[PDB]
Amino acid sequence: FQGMKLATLKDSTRDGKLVVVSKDLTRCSEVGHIARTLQAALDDWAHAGPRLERVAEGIETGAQPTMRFHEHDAASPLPRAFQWADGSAYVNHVELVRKARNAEMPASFWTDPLIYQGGSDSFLGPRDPILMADDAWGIDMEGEAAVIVDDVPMGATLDEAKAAIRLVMLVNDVSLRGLIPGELAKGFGFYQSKPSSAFSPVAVTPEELGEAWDGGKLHLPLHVDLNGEPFGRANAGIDMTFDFPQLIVHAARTRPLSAGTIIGSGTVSNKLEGGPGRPVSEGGAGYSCIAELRMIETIEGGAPKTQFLKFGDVVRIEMKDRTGHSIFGAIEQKVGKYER
Amino acid sequence: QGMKLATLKDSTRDGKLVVVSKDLTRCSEVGHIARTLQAALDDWAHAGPRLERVAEGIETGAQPTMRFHEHDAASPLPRAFQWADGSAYVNHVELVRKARNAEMPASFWTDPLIYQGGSDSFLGPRDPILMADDAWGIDMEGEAAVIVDDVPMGATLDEAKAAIRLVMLVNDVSLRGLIPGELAKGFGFYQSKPSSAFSPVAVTPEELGEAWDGGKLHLPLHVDLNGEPFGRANAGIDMTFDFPQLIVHAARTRPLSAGTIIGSGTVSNKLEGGPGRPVSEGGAGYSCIAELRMIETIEGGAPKTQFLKFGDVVRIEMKDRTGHSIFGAIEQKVGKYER
Ligand SMILES: [Ca+2]
Ligand SMILES: [Ca+2]
């Protein structure tokens, strides 16, 4: 027996309720005698992990009592986290955005990973609406993968970083494109322009991924849908200039990463014949965000065309295994106005 | 009447919450109320008043106590769900721009800077600042911070001020050597901003008395370098953005959950316009070496004062009108990290 899936169910507490989820995402089991929350399990993984694995095995064989798992009831696996740090591993994407400003990208960007520190304390659940005051802010989804690490020492090596990867999940790094230029122009990175993100209903162990996980990257299309229509099928194993251990090593240069740290891959992006990717409806692999499409329209046609997310739109993100079954469950979110 | 809270280091990640006497000599575990500061903040509307009764008992002698050792204290939140650090003393920003020779857009006087910081691995007040290389421009940064209860997205100044729960000092450890290179990448600070440290004790606004005016702390911030007065800059002067303003800015497009830490940015004072002078010369000095080097470069050509090297010792504390330490002392020796 190999692999397991974990989820956090919304409840009256801030950290929610940890459950072990069946491979098919239909059944789950509370595990309060081992750990009440995912963070607690991570805090003591060396001991809690093996015990959760036995529960996972028991769910598979039916020896373990279960209830129904409802993605609509899931929080993000860590509803609040101690760290959210997001890379830009598909350096093609940042090349496109840099090139749209009609500027050249330093060679250094192929060798030196980007990362930003994100808000970690108020993540949206996979099915919660993206609520915002104003959709003139260039609301955009950003489909990525993330790993959750155990403790990582300051100055960690690649072997250390690899070995510290405990869970994988999908992410929607919600962005406000209209606010980005002026904010970064302040010089202090992202804050207002990067609101609360959302993660998939389930996080899985590397073992669960099977051959789709090479120890440092995922080798599967990331399905991003917009209003029911395929928007991106970009392969997470293609054009990824920096893998997860590389991002982790980068992150740990001058600081430890405590257990529960979430590292984002950055928006998944694919080139086509060495050129900008083309849309799915044209045979291309599409895009994991609307920003990348607009950049390409800007380069191609001198300016953006396709509009960002407006109230009422729906975005879906999920990853399917070789046989077509969902691995992490689905992020599916309706954009709507925040009621104050 | 006010109170002081601390977290003692123990075998767990979140440490042991204690209530601390006003004189910082005694303290008491409060496990029947909350094991951790976070847990108290999570349920503050109920836990807060219970903790206040304990503080009151410590004061009268009714509550059994033990000795408080600042050396055994973690940061009050050893790990936090959020750390966001402003630069509310825009004077400092203007000086960094000046040493480069760019005018500052007048918008920096009405638009707060803020950045997302590492929150998961804070050093304790007396823990050493360990770095692999002291040629990275290791610098201290004295500031004040506030811990907030839940703040809704798009919160107002009134809600902002009402959400302030605790006040503490901070050393925002900075690697100046890496800052230029990192920021040029365009994604803000990460590698150049290592783990920070907070004061041994966090205190309620009420404890601060008049020195707190609801948005601002009005006392000198003591920064020492190897036992010498380096900064005595007043935290209520030249503070162009108050804490509520910092909070409202942070909350524009996101809620802030209970336990969110908001830093004011390095405390800096103008003399009468233009740069402050080094304490030894009658002025209020500085709360970071960087500010000093900017002043040296601007008037003179190039930095003359080195940053922190191994063996250097920094102290950061704040004393009330009567000269008693309010928060306890951050005191750290810079040292070589090795694996
Ligand atoms: Ca991103
Ligand atoms: Ca700072």
XYZ file of C-alpha atoms and ligand atoms in Angstrom:
681
model
C 0.000 0.000 0.000
C 1.168 3.503 -0.952
C 0.047 7.111 -0.691
C -2.676 9.078 1.072
C -4.899 12.131 0.785
C -5.748 14.569 3.565
C -8.339 17.301 3.841
C -9.536 19.897 6.354
C -13.293 20.247 6.839
C -14.758 23.609 7.794
C -16.120 23.705 11.378
C -16.442 26.128 14.330
C -12.691 26.342 14.890
C -10.157 28.374 12.949
C -8.014 25.406 11.921
C -10.887 23.169 10.903
C -11.110 19.423 11.138
C -8.499 17.064 9.692
C -9.749 14.062 7.725
C -8.139 11.315 5.721
C -9.750 11.075 2.291
C -10.241 8.057 0.021
C -8.316 7.981 -3.264
C -11.566 8.504 -5.185
C -12.384 11.537 -3.033
C -15.824 10.167 -2.052
C -15.245 8.978 1.529
C -13.352 10.368 4.519
C -12.623 9.751 8.191
C -12.051 12.056 11.147
C -8.829 11.203 13.035
C -9.073 13.142 16.300
C -7.182 10.489 18.284
C -4.131 11.251 16.120
C -4.498 14.901 15.139
C -7.363 17.389 15.149
C -5.821 19.605 12.432
C -3.455 19.196 9.499
C -1.013 21.612 11.142
C -0.893 19.449 14.276
C -0.106 16.389 12.129
C 2.671 18.335 10.385
C 4.062 19.626 13.676
C 4.661 15.969 14.686
C 4.813 14.350 11.238
C 7.470 11.771 12.037
C 4.935 10.265 14.466
C 1.537 11.310 13.104
C 2.288 10.506 9.452
C 2.670 6.744 9.826
C -0.555 6.665 11.897
C -2.512 8.552 9.247
C -1.129 6.138 6.627
C -2.652 3.203 8.526
C -5.992 5.042 8.507
C -5.630 5.665 4.764
C -4.984 1.947 4.237
C -8.026 1.092 6.366
C -10.223 3.359 4.260
C -8.998 1.639 1.108
C -9.785 -1.828 2.496
C -13.025 -0.712 4.145
C -11.853 -1.717 7.635
C -12.092 1.954 8.648
C -15.546 3.570 9.167
C -16.086 6.652 6.982
C -18.565 9.363 6.054
C -19.117 11.188 2.748
C -16.480 13.710 1.665
C -18.005 16.902 0.266
C -15.601 19.251 -1.510
C -18.189 21.982 -0.896
C -17.445 21.534 2.820
C -13.659 21.518 2.625
C -11.478 24.397 3.766
C -8.048 24.772 2.196
C -6.011 21.906 3.683
C -4.288 24.513 5.833
C -7.056 27.146 6.311
C -4.362 29.255 7.903
C -0.656 28.666 7.468
C 2.503 30.015 9.008
C 4.079 30.653 5.595
C 3.026 31.010 1.975
C 5.891 31.700 -0.419
C 5.260 31.641 -4.124
C 7.865 31.084 -6.813
C 7.771 31.839 -10.531
C 9.158 28.532 -11.713
C 7.859 28.773 -15.279
C 10.183 31.607 -16.230
C 8.548 31.790 -19.648
C 5.626 33.563 -17.985
C 7.704 36.354 -16.469
C 9.497 36.712 -19.820
C 6.110 37.360 -21.480
C 5.090 39.983 -18.915
C 8.521 41.630 -19.114
C 8.418 41.556 -22.932
C 4.962 43.137 -23.007
C 6.403 46.202 -21.270
C 8.731 45.925 -24.273
C 11.692 45.330 -21.972
C 14.500 42.767 -22.023
C 14.777 40.125 -19.295
C 18.257 39.696 -17.728
C 19.905 36.324 -18.438
C 20.122 35.981 -14.666
C 16.410 35.131 -14.509
C 17.094 31.675 -15.943
C 19.412 30.900 -13.027
C 18.021 32.914 -10.102
C 14.475 31.904 -8.937
C 11.922 34.547 -8.065
C 9.879 34.178 -4.929
C 7.487 36.385 -3.006
C 6.101 36.178 0.528
C 2.317 35.898 0.433
C -0.627 36.222 2.822
C -1.067 32.904 4.642
C -3.640 33.593 7.304
C -7.009 33.767 5.521
C -7.094 31.262 2.672
C -10.391 30.706 0.878
C -11.835 27.197 0.679
C -11.698 25.425 -2.724
C -15.368 26.169 -3.401
C -15.710 29.556 -1.662
C -16.456 32.534 -3.878
C -13.761 35.001 -4.776
C -15.373 38.037 -3.150
C -14.006 41.439 -4.072
C -15.188 45.049 -3.824
C -14.587 45.991 -7.458
C -14.033 43.959 -10.610
C -12.327 46.881 -12.323
C -9.254 45.699 -10.393
C -8.277 43.106 -13.030
C -9.275 40.049 -11.011
C -7.384 37.000 -12.272
C -7.011 33.377 -11.271
C -3.556 31.844 -11.262
C -3.349 28.074 -11.412
C -0.312 26.509 -9.720
C 0.913 23.558 -7.678
C 2.237 23.879 -4.115
C 4.138 21.638 -1.710
C 3.943 21.672 2.074
C 7.355 21.046 3.701
C 8.442 19.656 7.046
C 11.035 21.709 8.915
C 13.846 22.919 6.642
C 17.132 24.209 8.108
C 18.632 27.556 7.155
C 21.100 26.918 4.350
C 19.396 23.672 3.434
C 20.844 21.615 0.581
C 18.924 20.166 -2.382
C 18.818 16.701 -0.756
C 17.459 18.211 2.429
C 14.849 20.188 0.494
C 13.657 17.203 -1.534
C 13.367 15.026 1.575
C 11.341 17.712 3.394
C 8.445 17.673 0.891
C 5.447 16.124 2.717
C 2.325 17.021 0.705
C 1.336 18.395 -2.703
C -1.762 20.392 -3.583
C -3.149 22.738 -6.221
C -3.585 26.481 -5.811
C -5.395 29.492 -7.188
C -3.138 32.456 -6.475
C -5.874 35.093 -6.776
C -4.469 38.315 -8.242
C -5.566 41.911 -8.854
C -3.818 42.794 -12.090
C -4.955 46.423 -12.100
C -3.216 47.006 -8.761
C 0.004 45.134 -9.504
C 1.964 47.696 -11.551
C 1.453 50.576 -9.110
C 2.147 48.398 -6.091
C 5.388 46.851 -7.305
C 6.283 50.390 -8.415
C 6.247 51.281 -4.698
C 9.074 48.732 -4.551
C 8.014 46.561 -1.607
C 6.567 43.637 -3.572
C 3.002 42.320 -3.426
C 0.387 43.032 -0.809
C -2.885 44.703 -1.825
C -2.505 43.204 -5.322
C -2.397 39.610 -4.012
C -5.547 38.848 -1.960
C -6.403 35.606 -0.205
C -5.540 32.492 -2.196
C -7.331 29.131 -2.358
C -6.072 25.532 -2.380
C -7.527 22.227 -3.620
C -9.919 20.184 -1.346
C -7.157 17.608 -0.879
C -3.391 17.508 -0.365
C -1.591 14.275 -1.284
C 1.686 12.618 -0.371
C 4.348 12.323 -3.080
C 3.807 8.532 -3.013
C 0.178 9.074 -4.009
C 1.292 10.837 -7.197
C 3.101 7.770 -8.482
C 5.049 8.234 -11.699
C 3.430 11.651 -12.160
C 5.881 12.915 -9.503
C 9.611 12.772 -10.247
C 10.541 13.927 -6.741
C 10.720 17.594 -7.746
C 8.044 18.284 -10.357
C 4.575 17.074 -11.435
C 4.255 15.744 -14.999
C 0.568 16.253 -15.778
C -1.659 18.853 -17.394
C -3.155 21.424 -15.040
C -6.801 21.896 -16.020
C -7.893 25.509 -15.743
C -11.460 26.192 -16.905
C -13.179 29.540 -17.296
C -16.970 29.569 -17.327
C -17.101 25.865 -18.165
C -14.663 26.167 -21.056
C -11.126 24.759 -21.105
C -8.689 27.676 -20.753
C -5.467 25.897 -19.851
C -4.080 22.379 -20.042
C -0.459 23.378 -19.500
C 1.786 20.523 -18.383
C 3.332 21.158 -14.962
C 6.448 19.182 -16.006
C 7.141 21.351 -19.086
C 9.019 24.694 -19.175
C 9.539 24.573 -15.422
C 12.947 26.168 -15.151
C 13.103 25.604 -11.355
C 11.693 22.511 -9.549
C 10.364 22.462 -5.993
C 13.594 21.499 -4.259
C 15.266 24.388 -6.108
C 12.623 26.840 -4.809
C 12.925 25.436 -1.286
C 16.709 25.737 -1.329
C 16.256 29.293 -2.557
C 13.734 30.038 0.205
C 15.996 28.609 2.911
C 19.116 30.583 2.032
C 18.959 32.898 5.044
C 16.084 31.484 7.081
C 14.642 28.186 8.348
C 11.318 27.032 6.959
C 9.117 25.657 9.758
C 6.908 22.573 9.255
C 3.710 23.659 7.457
C 5.473 26.011 5.091
C 3.738 26.170 1.733
C 5.887 26.712 -1.382
C 4.090 27.724 -4.576
C 5.402 26.886 -8.044
C 3.973 30.007 -9.646
C 1.572 30.016 -12.581
C 1.980 26.970 -14.811
C 3.043 28.077 -18.302
C 4.021 26.245 -21.521
C 5.663 27.528 -24.687
C 4.792 26.285 -28.177
C 7.606 25.664 -30.682
C 9.772 28.076 -28.676
C 7.035 30.683 -28.990
C 4.235 31.998 -26.784
C 1.689 29.285 -26.030
C -1.488 29.205 -28.090
C -5.109 28.735 -26.862
C -6.648 25.328 -26.217
C -9.287 25.785 -28.926
C -6.387 26.087 -31.387
C -4.595 22.927 -30.285
C -2.354 24.853 -27.911
C -1.966 24.068 -24.202
C -3.625 27.350 -23.243
C -2.859 29.305 -20.063
C -3.165 29.112 -16.280
C -4.128 32.795 -15.967
C -5.794 35.477 -18.039
C -2.789 37.783 -17.634
C -0.577 35.526 -19.815
C -3.153 35.538 -22.598
C -3.382 39.353 -22.489
C 0.411 39.715 -22.579
C 0.476 37.548 -25.728
C -2.329 39.565 -27.304
C -0.324 42.699 -26.380
C 2.791 41.332 -28.090
C 0.827 39.870 -30.991
C -1.839 42.542 -31.451
C -0.315 45.559 -29.724
C -2.738 45.459 -26.786
C -4.868 43.238 -24.513
C -8.199 41.811 -25.773
C -9.683 39.147 -23.480
C -11.010 40.651 -20.260
C -10.169 39.705 -16.689
C -12.668 38.002 -14.346
C -15.924 39.885 -13.734
C -18.620 39.250 -11.110
C -20.506 36.126 -12.079
C -17.626 34.332 -13.737
C -16.544 30.878 -12.573
C -13.066 29.421 -12.472
C -12.174 25.740 -12.057
C -8.771 24.192 -11.381
C -7.965 20.471 -11.038
C -5.379 17.878 -12.075
C -6.258 14.449 -13.430
C -4.143 11.317 -13.315
C -3.181 9.199 -16.334
C -6.623 7.525 -16.167
C -8.712 10.702 -15.921
C -9.504 10.701 -12.196
C -9.090 13.863 -10.108
C -6.043 13.767 -7.856
C -6.632 16.761 -5.575
C -10.319 17.477 -6.123
C -11.497 20.678 -7.767
C -10.997 24.316 -6.986
C -14.172 25.841 -8.352
C -14.941 29.439 -7.483
C -17.552 32.055 -8.369
C -16.391 35.676 -8.514
C -18.785 38.036 -6.775
C -19.005 41.330 -4.932
C -17.893 41.520 -1.305
C -20.801 42.596 0.920
C -19.710 45.028 3.623
C -5.332 48.993 34.379
C -3.457 46.966 31.753
C -1.351 43.805 31.557
C 1.763 42.181 30.097
C 1.954 38.816 28.312
C 4.875 36.608 27.312
C 5.678 33.230 25.807
C 8.249 31.052 27.533
C 10.231 28.608 25.423
C 9.344 24.971 25.987
C 9.246 21.630 24.172
C 6.403 22.775 21.927
C 6.356 24.961 18.843
C 4.104 27.657 20.339
C 5.704 27.818 23.782
C 4.021 28.533 27.095
C 1.827 31.601 27.588
C 2.441 33.527 30.822
C 1.159 36.744 32.395
C 4.028 38.952 33.560
C 4.220 41.495 36.402
C 4.555 45.150 35.460
C 8.123 45.235 36.772
C 8.945 42.172 34.617
C 10.310 40.178 37.574
C 7.501 37.651 38.097
C 5.101 35.670 35.930
C 2.432 33.007 36.005
C 1.448 30.187 33.692
C -2.279 30.314 32.821
C -2.899 26.876 31.302
C -6.516 26.783 32.483
C -7.262 29.781 30.238
C -4.896 29.419 27.263
C -1.784 27.294 26.634
C -0.496 29.771 24.050
C -0.776 33.441 23.135
C -2.324 32.483 19.797
C -5.030 30.494 21.545
C -5.830 33.493 23.705
C -5.976 35.771 20.655
C -8.144 33.219 18.810
C -10.732 33.525 21.613
C -9.835 36.958 22.976
C -13.353 38.170 23.792
C -13.471 35.469 26.465
C -9.800 34.835 27.285
C -8.745 38.496 27.551
C -10.858 39.366 30.609
C -9.813 36.137 32.333
C -6.163 37.000 31.760
C -6.774 40.514 33.120
C -7.977 39.018 36.407
C -4.722 37.061 36.604
C -2.646 40.198 36.005
C -4.628 41.896 38.753
C -3.878 38.992 41.080
C -0.170 39.076 40.248
C -0.246 42.740 41.224
C -1.932 42.171 44.608
C 0.061 39.054 45.465
C -2.951 36.753 45.413
C -1.768 34.893 42.291
C 1.165 32.502 42.828
C 4.060 33.463 40.532
C 7.544 32.326 39.577
C 10.599 34.253 38.412
C 10.455 35.736 34.893
C 13.660 35.203 32.902
C 13.840 37.218 29.667
C 16.548 34.781 28.530
C 13.934 31.985 28.544
C 11.329 33.952 26.585
C 10.426 33.292 22.990
C 8.927 36.101 20.924
C 5.353 36.444 22.220
C 4.219 34.746 19.019
C 7.121 32.354 18.300
C 5.321 31.639 15.032
C 2.498 33.823 13.625
C -0.006 33.644 10.792
C 1.017 37.068 9.571
C 3.788 39.636 9.845
C 3.405 42.763 7.744
C 5.844 45.605 8.177
C 5.190 49.196 7.166
C 7.531 52.141 6.779
C 5.422 54.679 8.617
C 8.326 57.052 9.212
C 8.502 58.181 5.613
C 11.445 60.386 6.601
C 13.601 57.257 6.517
C 12.380 56.336 3.027
C 13.184 59.851 1.801
C 16.754 59.452 3.069
C 17.301 56.132 1.281
C 16.008 57.719 -1.928
C 18.204 60.775 -1.399
C 21.417 58.773 -1.002
C 20.527 57.363 -4.436
C 19.507 60.807 -5.738
C 15.908 60.218 -6.796
C 13.214 62.652 -5.723
C 10.532 60.948 -3.687
C 7.097 60.997 -5.300
C 4.935 63.209 -3.059
C 2.563 60.224 -2.995
C 4.746 58.464 -0.425
C 3.311 60.966 2.069
C -0.225 59.699 1.565
C 0.392 56.124 0.462
C 1.840 53.667 3.009
C 4.539 51.208 2.060
C 4.067 47.709 3.466
C 5.592 44.294 2.850
C 4.826 40.672 3.696
C 7.412 39.203 6.051
C 8.533 35.809 7.310
C 6.328 34.930 10.268
C 7.031 31.266 11.013
C 10.422 31.297 12.763
C 10.963 34.323 14.998
C 14.099 34.541 17.151
C 13.671 34.993 20.899
C 14.590 38.392 22.451
C 17.972 37.109 23.707
C 18.649 34.610 20.892
C 21.767 35.387 18.821
C 21.477 36.669 15.263
C 23.168 33.832 13.410
C 24.184 34.391 9.790
C 26.417 32.490 7.384
C 28.193 35.660 6.285
C 28.547 39.072 7.949
C 29.476 40.620 4.585
C 25.772 40.566 3.765
C 25.339 43.902 5.532
C 23.691 42.576 8.686
C 21.657 45.409 10.196
C 19.216 45.885 13.047
C 15.920 47.733 12.716
C 14.165 48.872 15.877
C 10.408 49.260 15.507
C 7.171 48.862 17.379
C 4.440 46.436 16.397
C 0.831 45.716 17.205
C -1.047 42.421 17.324
C -4.577 42.667 15.968
C -7.772 40.742 16.600
C -9.761 39.825 13.472
C -9.972 42.723 10.991
C -12.481 42.474 8.115
C -11.509 43.169 4.502
C -11.983 46.867 3.755
C -11.998 47.746 7.465
C -12.345 51.378 8.585
C -10.061 53.425 10.854
C -12.540 52.946 13.723
C -12.592 49.160 13.306
C -8.825 49.259 12.791
C -8.144 51.020 16.085
C -10.634 48.820 17.930
C -8.760 45.707 16.760
C -5.413 46.561 18.351
C -4.825 44.067 21.207
C -1.155 44.168 22.140
C 1.952 46.249 21.592
C 5.566 45.070 21.418
C 8.997 46.011 20.071
C 10.761 44.333 17.184
C 14.172 43.973 15.598
C 13.487 43.592 11.882
C 16.731 41.842 10.988
C 17.889 42.980 7.550
C 20.641 41.934 5.197
C 21.333 45.251 3.468
C 23.904 43.664 1.155
C 21.156 41.591 -0.457
C 18.371 44.184 -0.453
C 19.349 46.076 -3.652
C 19.794 42.875 -5.637
C 16.619 41.292 -4.360
C 14.311 44.271 -4.856
C 15.624 44.754 -8.414
C 14.101 41.348 -9.146
C 10.751 43.037 -8.534
C 9.063 40.757 -5.986
C 9.829 42.452 -2.667
C 11.877 41.068 0.221
C 12.598 37.444 0.963
C 16.250 36.404 1.260
C 17.254 39.916 2.409
C 14.816 39.786 5.329
C 15.754 36.862 7.655
C 13.975 35.938 10.874
C 13.075 38.900 13.076
C 12.832 39.052 16.866
C 10.252 40.619 19.206
C 10.361 41.979 22.769
C 10.151 39.596 25.771
C 6.762 40.996 26.697
C 3.692 42.240 24.805
C 1.396 44.705 26.559
C -2.141 45.974 26.229
C -2.704 49.574 25.099
C -4.191 50.268 28.516
C -0.878 49.311 30.147
C 0.877 51.927 28.073
C -1.017 54.732 29.773
C -0.633 58.177 28.167
C 2.396 57.069 26.150
C -0.151 55.444 23.860
C -2.608 57.710 22.063
C -4.632 55.011 20.278
C -2.555 54.984 17.108
C 0.906 55.969 18.226
C 3.447 55.233 20.954
C 5.042 58.477 22.217
C 8.381 57.479 23.779
C 12.035 57.189 22.750
C 13.042 53.835 21.297
C 16.352 52.778 22.809
C 18.785 51.162 20.421
C 22.245 50.246 21.636
C 25.286 49.081 19.732
C 27.848 47.256 21.849
C 26.575 49.013 24.945
C 26.408 52.496 23.435
C 23.329 54.705 22.817
C 22.748 54.521 19.067
C 19.102 55.514 18.820
C 16.797 57.378 21.159
C 14.360 58.369 18.452
C 10.834 59.148 19.609
C 8.233 56.756 18.205
C 5.564 59.468 18.163
C 7.522 62.005 16.098
C 7.787 62.014 12.310
C 5.457 59.011 12.215
C 3.560 59.969 9.076
C 1.303 56.881 9.285
C -0.267 55.644 12.530
C -0.971 52.009 13.362
C -4.665 52.187 12.418
C -3.647 53.702 9.091
C -1.194 50.857 8.551
C -3.944 48.405 9.446
C -6.544 49.959 7.128
C -4.030 49.857 4.260
C -3.168 46.216 4.945
C -6.865 45.304 5.056
C -8.003 46.914 1.773
C -8.278 43.688 -0.246
C -7.950 41.054 2.464
C -9.171 40.290 5.967
C -6.511 40.094 8.676
C -7.012 37.173 11.082
C -6.482 37.302 14.866
C -2.771 37.275 15.717
C -1.737 39.321 12.686
C 1.369 41.370 13.524
C 1.732 44.858 12.043
C 5.101 46.630 12.270
C 5.569 50.388 12.088
C 8.881 50.356 10.264
C 12.171 51.693 11.577
C 11.541 54.596 13.959
C 13.266 57.702 12.594
C 13.362 61.359 13.597
C 14.145 64.496 11.611
C 16.216 67.059 13.490
C 14.373 70.212 12.421
C 14.205 69.195 8.817
C 17.072 67.229 7.321
C 18.901 64.335 9.079
C 19.022 63.585 12.804
C 22.387 63.630 14.566
C 24.115 60.745 16.461
C 23.109 60.716 20.152
C 26.658 61.671 21.137
C 25.996 64.995 19.411
C 22.666 66.035 20.931
C 20.203 64.503 18.468
C 18.047 61.395 18.715
C 20.314 59.073 16.732
C 18.892 56.234 14.627
C 17.084 52.898 14.972
C 19.178 51.268 12.251
C 22.718 51.507 10.905
C 21.385 51.919 7.358
C 19.898 55.307 8.148
C 23.281 56.377 9.482
C 25.119 55.232 6.346
C 22.655 57.061 4.112
C 23.320 60.282 6.024
C 27.057 59.638 5.761
C 26.863 59.014 2.011
C 24.508 61.920 1.323
C 26.764 64.367 3.176
C 30.262 63.074 2.449
C 30.155 60.696 -0.515
C 30.280 57.173 0.951
C 29.356 55.046 4.008
C 31.891 55.279 6.840
C 30.148 53.211 9.516
C 30.179 49.451 9.037
C 27.165 47.240 9.540
C 26.924 44.487 12.154
C 29.785 42.003 12.286
C 30.155 38.832 14.348
C 30.470 39.725 18.017
C 28.451 42.924 17.700
C 25.671 43.289 20.270
C 22.383 45.093 19.750
C 19.886 46.094 22.415
C 16.383 47.426 21.866
C 14.066 48.520 24.684
C 11.654 51.285 25.653
C 11.224 52.901 29.079
C 8.207 54.760 30.436
C 8.124 58.306 31.820
C 9.623 56.982 35.066
C 12.504 55.088 33.424
C 11.267 51.530 33.860
C 11.445 49.080 30.941
C 7.982 48.491 29.515
C 8.529 45.514 27.206
C 11.786 44.088 28.452
C 14.912 44.036 26.313
C 15.735 42.548 22.958
C 19.447 41.854 23.225
C 21.265 39.924 20.555
C 24.833 39.103 19.644
C 25.569 38.578 15.971
C 27.284 35.263 15.291
C 28.348 32.803 12.608
C 25.826 30.236 11.454
C 27.423 26.887 10.724
C 26.124 23.464 9.741
Ca 1.786 33.294 -8.334
Ca 11.749 47.074 8.584
